[PDB]
């Protein structure tokens, strides 16, 4: 059984260094009955690989960690190929920058144009769809799956007051900083941010990442606390606080929409509960609020704190002792408004 | 001078192709226009270059040509022509089997087909920007006056509790498909789906289009509920719609780890709140006074009082529910028992 892979990447690199890739590739691909082509053009690599499923996969894992390229995207995988596309070529390297033949110029220009455009579109794609494509899965074909998820929601305290008083550029700087911190920490704990909705960050963890979701939440709150006293009191970042809600439930995860517009969405009750628990933190002495189901997913010896039943009928709300606000929330929102007067 | 590159989907023969090339060569010679037309696996690629007012004069006619569909202009740029000798060189890349070109041909095909998939996930604003020759990654966020639209599915948690997953997915896809088609038909821009919610925007000149979008959606769902049998889950599909108006910052937001087109501002939150509020109203549509002020048509506006500082909520008479929402939510659950 044989498969064929095509990927693109960003060149990180001397002309003689690329020759060394060709040299080694030809040797290894001959031994392993792998065939294919490597092209390069205006700082991008294009490679097609084909051969026995297992030898191709071992090579691709190796290519994934090669530091001579970054931002690798496997565009297409074919699983039960009958013929090789390049049966004579262990690894043929083609420098398309070198080809100035007039009849190849249109195709060369179009490949560069469409691939650069493709690379821009990738930046707006959701991580989960990027993952599916990388795994050889048709996002337009795969069925959504019911999965057990911890939903994470966070947003900026008194964000309407920030947007009312601050210039547009300052708001953007602040929001970008907030999104950067949240995204880096969520991703470091193995979570996936799903969307930004206004100033809100929506993310998800698996049922085995209960403690990681609490740690992520506590780490975000901690980094904002550091940031607020790192900056001068006139920097808008001095005013940046967050609240976080977590929920746990069955959600349907997948690609939804029509041929006119697709998106990657999570469907289910847990989404709205986590959002509502996020909003509830504004009137709690804790910056983090979550459901009994989230507590059930935790293994670590947190000092859980029962905050009673709250209408979202009414459910129990929990937090942990580390999430206690060192401040009174209403005074902070008034202080935020006075600072920008 | 100007140079355009676009792609397009061929809409369902050699001598018809030849007519495009023959007639293009004549006009492009007349207009001093040069370029190349490539086709491959049902896709057109074309590059056009020439004096500014000459090429876009021809691109407007290419746009409304019936022989291709889903036209995306990928690039707009000029000192020197790229194809000075070709009024229009047509290249059928399907019927070239030369061995050294099949690598480039296969990459062109795979990346373009992949590009067409990614296009479907983009914010409408980004697709609009690319089409207008502007790279969306380098636009700085701008404060714009927008009408924000939120719609979601009534009693959706009951539907998700009772229906098989695949039936939920068919139902949500139908809903999204209806909302997206109509929003886009009225010139609105869908920005994202969030759970079962559709988020979209309209400009301040589109107050009446925003209300008409909302009523068309409600009206199509009402048609659909009696088109299908009472055992089809689409028999149970209702929406509520919230609209707000305000200053919002639109643009790229995030970091290298995750970036996205976002809308920031109170109007976003207000529209979602008013969408949720329709549950407790005799009307499936609620909007602010600012949306009302954006409307030129003689709607029968109905003032529904202030709601939590409080804000005034309006609707139109045509948005009145013929049902009572509590009974309907109970009916949905009972039906699914
Ligand atoms: C763009 C690119 C393409 C590559 N293609 C191949 C290839 O086709 N076959 C191969 O053996 N190595 C390829 N390599 C390099 C391998 O990842 C790796 O550096 C080396 O070949 C294996 O080292 P090893 O002999 O210790 O296993 C490629 C590297 C880059 C950057
Ligand atoms: C893919 C495609 C590419 C085309 N390219 C050109 C072109 O480059 N120049 C041109 O005059 N017409 C081109 N046409 C055809 C125009 O849409 C239209 O048929 C033509 O301009 C008719 O000219 P007329 O105003 O004399 O009727 C193209 C059509 C298609 C479907
Ligand atoms: Ca906020
Ligand atoms: Ca809903
Ligand atoms: Cl930081
Ligand atoms: Cl701990
Ligand atoms: Cl604790
Ligand atoms: Cl947004
Ligand atoms: Cl009217
Ligand atoms: Cl009316």
Domain definitions of chain A by residue range: 1-142, 143-341
User: In a 3-state reduction of DSSP, which class is residue B134?
Assistant: coil
Q: How many CB atoms lie within 10 A of CB A100?
A: 8
Of the candidates B40, B132, B37, B130, the one whose C-alpha atom is nearest the C-alpha of residue B86 is: B37
**CB-facing half-sphere around the CA of B149: CA atoms within 13 A:** 32
**Minimal Cα–Cα distance from A115 to chain B, Å?**
7
B163 Cβ contact list (under 8 Å, min separation 6)? B171, B233, B336
B288 Cβ contact list (under 8 Å, min separation 6)? B243, B244, B245, B270, B274, B311, B312, B313, B314
At residue A94, φ and ψ (nearest 5 deg) are -130, 115
CA–centroid distance, residue B299 to ligand 9 (Å):
5
Contact indicator for A247, A210 with CB cutoff of 8 Å: no
Which residues are registered as beta bridge partners of B249? Answer: B143, B264
Residue A288, phi-psi category: left (phi > 0), alpha (psi -120 to 50), beta (remainder):
beta
The encoded tokens of residue A15 equal 């002309």
- H-assigned helices in chain A: 15-31, 53-64, 105-123, 127-134, 159-165, 168-188, 210-230, 269-280, 292-296, 329-339
Residue B28, phi-psi category: left (phi > 0), alpha (psi -120 to 50), beta (remainder):
alpha
Residues of A in contact with B120 (CB under 8 A): 140, 257, 259-262
CA–centroid distance, residue B60 to ligand 2 (Å):
10
Contact indicator for A183, B258 with CB cutoff of 8 Å: yes
- How far apart CA B251 and CA B144 sit, in angstroms, is 10
* Alpha carbon distance, N-terminus to C-terminus of chain A: 70
Of the candidates B168, B194, B118, the one whose C-alpha atom is nearest the C-alpha of residue A145 is: B168
Q: What angle do CA A213, A216, A220 make, to 5 degrees?
A: 145
- How far apart CA A211 and CA A298 sit, in angstroms, is 5
- Residue position matching structure tokens 């896809």: B173
The encoded tokens of residue B150 equal 């939120």
The encoded tokens of residue A119 equal 């690379």
Closest-lying ligand 2 atom to the alpha carbon of residue B39: 1
B133 Cβ contact list (under 8 Å, min separation 6)? B73, B75, B76, B77
The per-type count for chain A, helices as H runs and strands as E runs, is 10, 13
The encoded tokens of residue A334 equal 């008034």
Of the candidates B183, B287, B201, the one whose C-alpha atom is nearest the C-alpha of residue B244 is: B287
Beta pairing class for B259-264 and B239-254: antiparallel
- How far apart CA B16 and CA A214 sit, in angstroms, is 64
- Residue position matching structure tokens 């001068």: A232
- Helix (H) / strand (E) element for B183: namely helix B165-185
- How far apart CA B192 and CA B190 sit, in angstroms, is 6
Pocket test of ligand 2: the residue of B11, B20, B35 to mutate, having most ligand atoms within 8 Å of its CB, is B20
Q: What angle do CA B284, B289, B291 make, to 5 degrees?
A: 70
Residues of B in contact with A163 (CB under 8 A): 249, 264-266
* A10, A88, A106, best to mutate vs chain B, most B CBs in 10 Å: A106
Of the candidates A129, A133, A9, the one whose C-alpha atom is nearest the C-alpha of residue A69 is: A9
The encoded tokens of residue B306 equal 């202030």
Who lines ligand 1 at CB under 6 A? Answer: A 9, 21, 24-25, 28-29, 38, 45, 47, 59, 62-63, 66, 68-69, 91
Which residues are registered as beta bridge partners of B2? Answer: B50
* A84, A101, A198, best to mutate vs chain B, most B CBs in 10 Å: A198
- How far apart CA B113 and CA B93 sit, in angstroms, is 15
**Which of A76, A172, A263 minimises the CB distance to B192?**
A263
Residues of B in contact with A83 (CB under 8 A): none
Radius of gyration of chain A (CA): 25
Question: Does any CB of chain A come closer than 8 Å to the CB of residue B217?
Answer: no
Of the candidates B68, B120, B82, B70, the one whose C-alpha atom is nearest the C-alpha of residue B2 is: B82
The per-type count for chain B, helices as H runs and strands as E runs, is 10, 13
- How far apart CA A241 and CA A177 sit, in angstroms, is 12
Tell me which ligand sits closest to the C-alpha of residue B8: 2
Question: Does any CB of chain B come closer than 8 Å to the CB of residue A189?
Answer: no
Q: How many CB atoms lie within 10 A of CB B17?
A: 16
Question: Does any CB of chain B come closer than 8 Å to the CB of residue A268?
Answer: yes
Final resolution, Å:
2.0
Please answer yes or no on whether B177 and A145 come within 8 Å at the CB atom: no
Of the candidates B206, B262, B272, the one whose C-alpha atom is nearest the C-alpha of residue B241 is: B272
**Which of A146, A193, A196 minimises the CB distance to B165?**
A146
Of the candidates B312, B75, B38, B264, the one whose C-alpha atom is nearest the C-alpha of residue A179 is: B264
Which residues are registered as beta bridge partners of B239? Answer: B153
Q: Produce one character per residue of A259-268: b if its CB has 16 or more CB atoms within 10 Å, e if not.
A: eebbbbbbbb
Please give the method by which this entry was determined.
X-ray
Of the candidates A121, A119, A94, A120, the one whose C-alpha atom is nearest the C-alpha of residue A108 is: A94
Beta pairing class for B142-153 and B43-50: unpaired
Contact indicator for A145, A252 with CB cutoff of 8 Å: yes
The encoded tokens of residue A278 equal 């996020």
Q: What angle do CA B163, B165, B169 make, to 5 degrees?
A: 100
The encoded tokens of residue A105 equal 């110029």
Contact indicator for B280, B273 with CB cutoff of 8 Å: no
**Minimal Cα–Cα distance from A322 to chain B, Å?**
28
Radius of gyration of chain B (CA): 24
The encoded tokens of residue B82 equal 């790229």
- How far apart CA B337 and CA B333 sit, in angstroms, is 6
User: In a 3-state reduction of DSSP, which class is residue B122?
Assistant: coil
CA torsion, ordered A129, A134, A139, A141, to nearest 10 deg: -160
**Minimal Cα–Cα distance from A263 to chain B, Å?**
6
A188 Cβ contact list (under 8 Å, min separation 6)? A216
Helical packing angle, A168-188 and A210-230, nearest 10°: 140
Residues of A in contact with B255 (CB under 8 A): 176, 179-180, 183-184
SS3 for B16-44 is HHHHHHHHHHHHHHHCCCEEEEEEECCEE
- Helix (H) / strand (E) element for A305: namely strand A304-311
Dihedral angle sign, alpha carbons of residues B292, B274, B141, B138:
negative
The encoded tokens of residue A167 equal 């210039």
At residue B243, φ and ψ (nearest 5 deg) are -130, 140
- How far apart CA B20 and CA B18 sit, in angstroms, is 5
Q: Cα dist. A8→A44, A55, A140, B100 in Å?
A: 7, 20, 21, 19
- Residue position matching structure tokens 């599915």: B153
CA–centroid distance, residue A40 to ligand 1 (Å):
15
């Amino acid at each position: 059984m044989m498969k064929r892979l095509v990927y693109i990447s960003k060149i990180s690199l001397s002309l003689e260094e690329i020759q060394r890739i060709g040299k080694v590739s030809i040797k290894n691909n001959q031994r392993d009955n792998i065939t294919g082509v490597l092209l390069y053009l205006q700082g991008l690599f294009f490679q097609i690989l084909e051969g026995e499923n297992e030898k191709v996969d071992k090579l691709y894992k190796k290519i994934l960690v090669d530091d001579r390229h970054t931002n690798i995207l496997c565009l297409k995988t074919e699983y039960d190929i009958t013929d090789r596309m390049f049966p004579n070529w262990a690894m043929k390297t083609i420098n398309l920058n070198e080809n100035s033949e007039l009849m190849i110029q249109p195709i060369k220009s179009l490949l560069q144009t469409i691939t650069q455009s493709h690379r821009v579109l990738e930046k707006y794609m959701p991580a989960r769809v990027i993952y599916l494509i990388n795994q050889g899965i048709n996002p337009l074909t795969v069925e959504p799956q019911l999965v057990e998820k911890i939903i994470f929601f966070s947003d900026i305290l008194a964000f309407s007051t920030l947007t009312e008083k601050l210039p547009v550029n300052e708001v953007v700087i602040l929001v970008n900083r907030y999104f950067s911190i949240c995204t880096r920490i969520i991703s470091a704990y193995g979570g996936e941010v799903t969307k930004f909705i206004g100033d809100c960050v929506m993310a998800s963890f698996t049922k085995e990442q209960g403690d990681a979701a609490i740690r992520t939440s506590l780490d975000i709150i901690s980094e904002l606390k550091q940031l607020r006293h790192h900056v001068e009191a006139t920097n808008p970042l001095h005013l940046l606080y967050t609240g976080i809600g977590l929920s746990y439930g069955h959600v349907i995860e997948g690609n939804m929409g029509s041929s006119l517009k697709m998106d990657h969405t999570l469907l289910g009750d847990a989404v709205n509960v986590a959002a509502r628990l996020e909003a509830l933190t504004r009137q709690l002495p804790y910056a983090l609020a979550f459901t009994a189901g989230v507590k059930k997913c935790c293994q670590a010896q947190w000092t859980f704190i029962n905050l009673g039943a709250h209408q979202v009928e009414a459910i129990e709300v929990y937090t942990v002792n580390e999430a206690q606000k060192y401040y009174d929330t209403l005074q902070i929102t008034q202080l935020i408004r006075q600072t920008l007067e």
